[PDB]
């Protein structure tokens, strides 16, 4: 009975979907698509942030570097909204430990 454990991001996506459109479901294949999508974006951002760190002789990757990467990759208003969400989130984290 060797029993594996393959991780994924499925359940979180399902939660968000039930939050935004309560009377709606989603097949497994589409969830797999969204999983691959998230993986792709994570890889892009991390790689970019790494290069930013190396060019400035900094050994710490910080929220600032993430912010910079997002401003590079993404266009306009999408970047602004993402940045606003991140700033609100980090501000809430820093206070209410």
């Amino acid at each position: 009975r060797k029993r594996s454990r393959k991780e994924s991001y499925s359940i979180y996506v399902y939660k968000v979907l039930k939050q935004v459109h309560p009377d709606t479901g989603i097949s497994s294949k589409a969830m797999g698509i969204m999983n691959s999508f998230v993986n792709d974006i994570f890889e892009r951002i991390a790689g970019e942030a790494s290069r930013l760190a190396h060019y400035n002789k900094r050994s710490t990757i910080t929220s600032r570097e993430i912010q910079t990467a997002v401003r590079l990759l993404l266009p306009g208003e999408l970047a602004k909204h993402a940045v606003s969400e991140g700033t609100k989130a980090v501000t809430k984290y820093t206070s209410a430990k």
Partner: protein
Amino acid sequence: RHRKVLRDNIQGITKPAIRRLARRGGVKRISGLIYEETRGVLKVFLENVIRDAVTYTEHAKRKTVTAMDVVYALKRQGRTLYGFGG
């Protein structure tokens, strides 16, 4: 008998299939010469992809080509693919 189905090869990828694909591309009227050229193009693409896949396959000492190798091979050519793992 020499049947060798249309060549026992690519020529089984018949004309109406290409026509259907051209219909997906918005095309209305197709010349007879397109078919052969299309096949050549397809062959080239496949070759490169398969090579990379097989190379990944050779690194792990396997004889079964997996989906993941193909996905990565498609990623390096700027043709990222979603919906088959990673």
